[PDB]
Amino acid sequence: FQSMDLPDIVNMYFDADSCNDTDALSETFAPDAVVEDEGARHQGVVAILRWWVAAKKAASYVAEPLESTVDGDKALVRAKVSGRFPGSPVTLTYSFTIKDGRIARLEIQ
Amino acid sequence: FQSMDLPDIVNMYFDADSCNDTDALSETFAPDAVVEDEGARHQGVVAILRWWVAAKKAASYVAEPLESTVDGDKALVRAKVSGRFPGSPVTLTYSFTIKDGRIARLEIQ
């Protein structure tokens, strides 16, 4: 696996996540976007930013993409998640839906 | 290949390089450290910072570690370098020498 395997926009998500870059992260999602993570659903870019800020304070995590497959408007990324949280590190699937050069949806499972 | 395959300190180098993080980068090298790159030698943390800043302006590059092997105090990392420069992208070997949880030397070839 290699970065270049990812759609530019998914790559921008992880760079921003990894560099704690709020601006870049905010510009990554559609205005109407949804994130489902940790038993919950966050709709709209405001809720998504709230969600991303809390998860950083809660665990100071690193998400590292390990492999990927792109199927249509969907991109599926396995990522090693590592940090201050019970059971660390754990491997997760990030399923991204891309509408119009932005992220419309992201399910973390 | 995976981040955890790298010594913590080598990983700090690439995270900082990647996030344009000058503080973190400066604290990565020994005071007496040397970087050899692009036909030239930079000694001391001041020269190293100068070198890192000019290269970022020159090419806005991304260095992405692809694989690694550790042998003794030495760590050898193949990295895909990508950017605004002739012949991009190119694969390079970063040879790091580690003395006391810092980098004493880095040769890029």
Overview of this structure, please?
Two copies of one chain form a homodimer. Chain A is of the alpha+beta class and 109 residues long. The first copy, chain A, has a single domain, classed as Roll (Nuclear Transport Factor 2, Chain: A), CATH 3.10.450.50. In chain A, 29% of the residues lie in helices and 45% in strands. Chain A has a six-stranded mixed β-sheet, with helices on one face. The longest helix of chain A has 15 residues. The first copy, chain A, is globular. At the A-B interface, helix 1 and strand 3 of A face strand 3 of B.
Strand order of the largest sheet of chain A: 2-1-6-5-4-3
Query: The CATH topology of chain A is what?
Result: Nuclear Transport Factor 2, Chain: A
User: What Rg of chain A do the Cα atoms give?
Assistant: 13 Å
Total strands of chain A: the figure is 6
Broad shape of chain A: globular
**Secondary-structure element string of chain A:** HHEEHEEEE
Number of domains of chain A: 1
PDB class: transferase
Keywords: PSI-Biology, nysgrc, putative polyketide cyclase, protein SMa1630, Structural Genomics, New York Structural Genomics Research Consortium, transferase
Assembly: dimeric
Entry title: Crystal structure of putative polyketide cyclase (protein SMa1630) from Sinorhizobium meliloti at 2.3 A resolution
